[PDB]
């Protein structure tokens, strides 16, 4: 609050150059959950600690991923419905890249279809722009690809994400293993490895139980495709993590 | 019949508040609403 009048509004600029909406914006992601996206050397893993308020809540079927065009995932932390707003952008103009040009629309040429679309809301005045922070990544001609998406409309290339409370926290045990495995780490421990980061990231709400939740691309063990889990994969992977941290 | 001194003094202190002013800027909006925001 260093300007009460340069707040109230958008499209403004402050003294300092300012335009403080975004910057309250990205107070609305810390009051999320975490996802996080890794990258390997094939393609990707995607996660998220999926909370849960109430015993009545049905197991695995209020899903949180969505699922672009077959080769490109997106996970969200923070305000859902303008993330899912966002994806239902992006799962149609993708689309529209496949329709004149018909190959499967790349992973970058995704994102400037987004980070420019973002951008649009934080420069008019009768809108108010996007509370969220999604990660997402996939698959295409030229390797793998993940990047991160933020509400100033910025994106960058990462080979770690994470988002949400636990923002300080897997930041950490995503600069270990970069240090561990510069090598590429395989489609099949990561995963679990990813389990591992969660369990440790809901320590600032060890209140409350939870769900956990997966959804993994990569070319290996699944020919180049988006997909979620199921079965011993994920239930091990749970068995691996709490293990570990007990 | 009396010898004592008095000396009335002004040990006690006083104050006279008349601080009268002028201008009061404190807050127009003239962007009630942004008069079309646009």
Same mark, same amino acid.
């Given at each position: 609050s260093i300007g009460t009048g340069y707040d !109230? &509004? #958008?499209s403004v600029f402050s003294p300092?150059?300012? #335009?403080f909406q975004v910057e309250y914006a990205v107070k609305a992601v810390e009051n999320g959950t975490t996802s996080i996206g890794i990258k390997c050397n094939d393609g990707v893993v995607f996660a998220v *600690? =999926? !909370?849960?308020? &109430? =015993?009545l809540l049905v197991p695995? =079927? #209020?899903? =949180?991923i969505q699922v672009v065009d077959r080769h490109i995932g997106c996970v969200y932390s923070g305000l859902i419905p303008d993330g899912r707003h966002l994806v239902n952008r992006g799962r149609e103009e993708a689309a529209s890249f496949k329709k004149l040009?018909?190959?499967?629309?790349p992973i970058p040429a995704f994102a400037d279809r987004l980070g420019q679309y973002v951008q649009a809301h934080t420069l008019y005045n009768s809108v108010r722009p996007f509370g969220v922070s999604t990660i997402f990544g996939g698959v295409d001609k030229n390797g793998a690809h993940l990047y991160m998406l933020e509400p100033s409309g910025s994106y960058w290339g990462y080979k770690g994400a994470a988002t949400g409370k636990g923002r300080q926290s897997a930041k950490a045990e995503l600069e270990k293993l970069v240090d561990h495995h510069p090598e590429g780490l395989s489609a099949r421990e990561a995963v679990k490895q990813a389990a591992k980061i969660i369990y440790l990231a809901h320590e600032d709400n060890k209140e409350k139980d939870f769900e956990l939740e997966i959804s993994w691309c990569s !070319? &290996? *063990?699944? #020919?180049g495709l988006h997909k979620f889990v199921k079965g011993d994969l994920l239930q091990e992977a749970i068995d691996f993590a709490q293990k570990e941290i007990n | 019949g009396g010898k004592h001194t008095f000396?009335?003094?002004?040990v006690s202190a006083r104050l006279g508040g008349a601080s009268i002013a002028v201008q009061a800027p404190a807050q127009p909006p003239p962007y009630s609403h942004h008069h079309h925001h646009h």
């Amino acid at each position: 609050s260093i300007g009460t009048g340069y707040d !109230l &509004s #958008n499209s403004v600029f402050s003294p300092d150059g300012r #335009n403080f909406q975004v910057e309250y914006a990205v107070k609305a992601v810390e009051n999320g959950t975490t996802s996080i996206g890794i990258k390997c050397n094939d393609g990707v893993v995607f996660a998220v *600690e =999926k !909370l849960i308020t &109430s =015993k009545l809540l049905v197991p695995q =079927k #209020n899903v =949180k991923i969505q699922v672009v065009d077959r080769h490109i995932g997106c996970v969200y932390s923070g305000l859902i419905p303008d993330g899912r707003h966002l994806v239902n952008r992006g799962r149609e103009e993708a689309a529209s890249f496949k329709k004149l040009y018909k190959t499967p629309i790349p992973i970058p040429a995704f994102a400037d279809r987004l980070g420019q679309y973002v951008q649009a809301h934080t420069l008019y005045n009768s809108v108010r722009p996007f509370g969220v922070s999604t990660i997402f990544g996939g698959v295409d001609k030229n390797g793998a690809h993940l990047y991160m998406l933020e509400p100033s409309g910025s994106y960058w290339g990462y080979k770690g994400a994470a988002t949400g409370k636990g923002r300080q926290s897997a930041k950490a045990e995503l600069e270990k293993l970069v240090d561990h495995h510069p090598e590429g780490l395989s489609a099949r421990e990561a995963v679990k490895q990813a389990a591992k980061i969660i369990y440790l990231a809901h320590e600032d709400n060890k209140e409350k139980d939870f769900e956990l939740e997966i959804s993994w691309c990569s !070319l &290996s *063990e699944t #020919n180049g495709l988006h997909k979620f889990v199921k079965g011993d994969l994920l239930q091990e992977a749970i068995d691996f993590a709490q293990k570990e941290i007990n | 019949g009396g010898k004592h001194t008095f000396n009335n003094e002004n040990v006690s202190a006083r104050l006279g508040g008349a601080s009268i002013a002028v201008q009061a800027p404190a807050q127009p909006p003239p962007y009630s609403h942004h008069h079309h925001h646009h």
